[PDB]
Amino acid sequence: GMTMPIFNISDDVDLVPAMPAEGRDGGSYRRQIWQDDVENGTIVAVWMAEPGIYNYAGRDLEETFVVVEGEALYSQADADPVKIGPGSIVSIAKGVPSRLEILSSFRKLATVIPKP
Amino acid sequence: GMTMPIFNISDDVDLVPAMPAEGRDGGSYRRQIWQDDVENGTIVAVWMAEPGIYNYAGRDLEETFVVVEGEALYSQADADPVKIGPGSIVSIAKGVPSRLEILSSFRKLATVIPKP
Ligand SMILES: [Cl-]
Numbered sequence A, B: 001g002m003t004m005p006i007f008n009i010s011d012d013v014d015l016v017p018a019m020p021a022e023g024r025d026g027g028s029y030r031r032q033i034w035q036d037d038v039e040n041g042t043i044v045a046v047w048m049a050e051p052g053i054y055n056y057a058g059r060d061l062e063e064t065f066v067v068v069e070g071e072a073l074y075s076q077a078d079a080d081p082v083k084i085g086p087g088s089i090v091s092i093a094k095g096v097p098s099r100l101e102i103l104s105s106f107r108k109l110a111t112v113i114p115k116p
Helices: none
Strands: A006-008 A016-020 A027-035 A043-049 A052-056 A061-069 A072-076 A082-084 A088-092 A098-102 A106-114 B006-008 B028-035 B043-049 B052-056 B061-069 B072-076 B082-084 B088-092 B098-102 B106-114
Touching: A027 A052, A027 B061, A027 B088, A061 B028, A061 B061, A072 A088, A088 B028, B072 B088
Parallel strands: none
Antiparallel strands: A006 B088, A016 A027, A027 A043, A043 A106, A052 A098, A061 A088, A061 A106, A072 A082, A072 A098, A088 B006, B028 B043, B043 B106, B052 B098, B061 B088, B061 B106, B072 B082, B072 B098
């Protein structure tokens, strides 16, 4: 029959370099999985990152992600970092800055709703 | 979480019972994590289910989920089943039926995009 649209988050395939970690010029990668064919459509993508520090300014979008592999110290805005790991699910509102201090090779599936 | 919108897929918090496996009367729950603040927008939710057969007809929605806990034999339409487990990412197009034979206590995080 036909092959189903099933992917393995662990597989390093079609990963495109994304944000580098502080102090070096590499660290994270993104793999788009699905995008709606409407303007400002919902996007689902894999983000993988190696240990290091990743700072994100507030962005014009809503995101919810789930961690499948790895651990990180995570914060939004002025909150003290909290440890997240496999099974953690995180939502971050439009315009809210965030920081990930990745502790071990980390993979999340992220749902992004553009809010231009 | 106490300080941020950090949830854990393993928490049995704000559960809503969901349709059980065909030969069962419980062991199936949903937990809504996030919904877009529009009339009929994207929803991100946990589903947690015990071993058994779960059949779904095609629905007027697009979905992508990732398995975080447990294993299942999984098929869509006329495809031969494949075993999915932690890290498996599955997309289901509008109108495509599916069958999930859960083999061990299962939790997924699903993104659902309504498509009337
Ligand atoms: Cl928290």
